[PDB]
């Protein structure tokens, strides 16, 4: 089969411009018309971005382009939006009921302003309560940068390997979301009075703390 | 116009076989054949394991086939294996400028646990729902697969007006955890009357309902 040529990554800048690339060959790319640029939001399912060369599908809004003098063949993205970081692959079609495919650019929209997560930290509910057990957490949307160190304070104290958080991603597109769970004892949360999450991203922390109060 | 509900999950085990389904409307999916699969896995440019439906794209194993009943689609691969968790893909075509995929799927066979996550409705507290702002979260724990799709509703209506998903990050124990972050401020919150978070799971579909309240 051999394979095909796109890049793996391309740098823009927020409200920029995008040149994609694709190196095929004389069957493809190289000979024949029946090219693709496909938009992953990266976690979603592909969804072409310009078909047929620059053949811009429903709503597919057009600062993208087809393009290319050969074998070789290119698609520009005039001015970024950030939603415009995805993955960006290309593909020609073959010789017949068959095409290829490959890797790449606009994937990089700096210009992206940095912010910071607003934690939101939640005690267990009632049912779970009622149920006889807890799990404790803290939640972390509007930021940027994801690369959070988030932490477990217990009456004023380090927690230690009771409590799981993962690697947060994307909102709409934009930037992340994060939520660390401290699974426990009613029993021990029930004794202990403090109750506080933190994150620690870029410099600044923000904690957030729960004590047997409410209601619920 | 893009409308595919292909299954979220499909359960690898060792030698096996599987199978998905995929599905939109009557007009394309019913009236007509039209939706081709992929493979994609692990970041890579997907592939091509149907290609028209009854046929596969040549130097493809004939394991894997299409199905639809005609309302929707099916697929199968006969054999389970480890070059198979990959991301499944598909599309119907469409108006020169549609042409739509299904979200994806997913495969598996090692060394692989089998059970089922663990979905938690915390509506919001009182210094939230306190000025201007709520949220709700429900997160999805341990899970041993963890392609869990998440939804919420209140009062019986669906949304996604509404909510961003936390993708099942990792609990080192190899197991799985997710969230569901849905704001509405205040408004919805207490401009309904319950609500709910709910999440099926390869063969599994457990819900979350819930309610309001004054607090105290």
């Known amino acids: 089969?051999?394979?095909?040529?796109?890049?793996?990554?391309?740098?823009?800048?927020?409200?920029?411009?995008?040149?994609?690339?694709?190196?095929?060959?004389?069957?493809?790319?190289?000979?024949?018309?029946?090219?693709?640029?496909?938009?992953?939001?990266?976690?979603?399912?592909?969804?072409?971005?310009?078909?047929?060369?620059?053949?811009?599908?429903?709503?597919?809004?057009?600062?993208?382009?087809?393009?290319?003098?050969?074998?070789?063949?290119?698609?520009?993205?005039?001015?970024?939006?950030?939603?415009?970081?995805?993955?960006?692959?290309?593909?020609?079609?073959?010789?017949?009921?068959?095409?290829?495919?490959?890797?790449?650019?606009?994937?990089?929209?700096?210009?992206?302003?940095?912010?910071?997560?607003?934690?939101?930290?939640?005690?267990?509910?009632?049912?779970?309560?009622?149920?006889?057990?807890?799990?404790?957490?803290?939640?972390?949307?509007?930021?940027?940068?994801?690369?959070?160190?988030?932490?477990?304070?217990?009456?004023?104290?380090?927690?230690?390997?009771?409590?799981?958080?993962?690697?947060?991603?994307?909102?709409?597109?934009?930037?992340?979301?994060?939520?660390?769970?401290?699974?426990?004892?009613?029993?021990?949360?029930?004794?202990?009075?403090?109750?506080?999450?933190?994150?620690?991203?870029?410099?600044?922390?923000?904690?957030?703390?729960?004590?047997?109060?409410?209601?619920? | 116009?893009?409308?595919?509900?292909?299954?979220?999950?499909?359960?690898?085990?060792?030698?096996?076989?599987?199978?998905?389904?995929?599905?939109?409307?009557?007009?394309?999916?019913?009236?007509?054949?039209?939706?081709?699969?992929?493979?994609?896995?692990?970041?890579?440019?997907?592939?091509?394991?149907?290609?028209?439906?009854?046929?596969?794209?040549?130097?493809?194993?004939?394991?894997?086939?299409?199905?639809?009943?005609?309302?929707?689609?099916?697929?199968?691969?006969?054999?389970?294996?480890?070059?198979?968790?990959?991301?499944?893909?598909?599309?119907?075509?469409?108006?020169?400028?549609?042409?739509?995929?299904?979200?994806?799927?997913?495969?598996?066979?090692?060394?692989?646990?089998?059970?089922?996550?663990?979905?938690?409705?915390?509506?919001?507290?009182?210094?939230?729902?306190?000025?201007?702002?709520?949220?709700?979260?429900?997160?999805?724990?341990?899970?041993?697969?963890?392609?869990?799709?998440?939804?919420?509703?209140?009062?019986?209506?669906?949304?996604?007006?509404?909510?961003?998903?936390?993708?099942?990050?990792?609990?080192?124990?190899?197991?799985?955890?997710?969230?569901?972050?849905?704001?509405?401020?205040?408004?919805?919150?207490?401009?309904?009357?319950?609500?709910?978070?709910?999440?099926?799971?390869?063969?599994?579909?457990?819900?979350?309902?819930?309610?309001?309240?004054?607090?105290?």
């Open positions: 599309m119907s075509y469409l108006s020169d400028a549609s042409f739509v």
């Open positions: 004389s069957s493809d790319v190289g000979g024949y018309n029946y």
């Open positions: 593909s020609s079609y073959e010789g017949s009921d068959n095409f290829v």
């Open positions: 047929e060369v620059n």
């Open positions: 028209a439906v009854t």
């Open positions: 009557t007009s394309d999916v019913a009236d007509s054949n039209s």
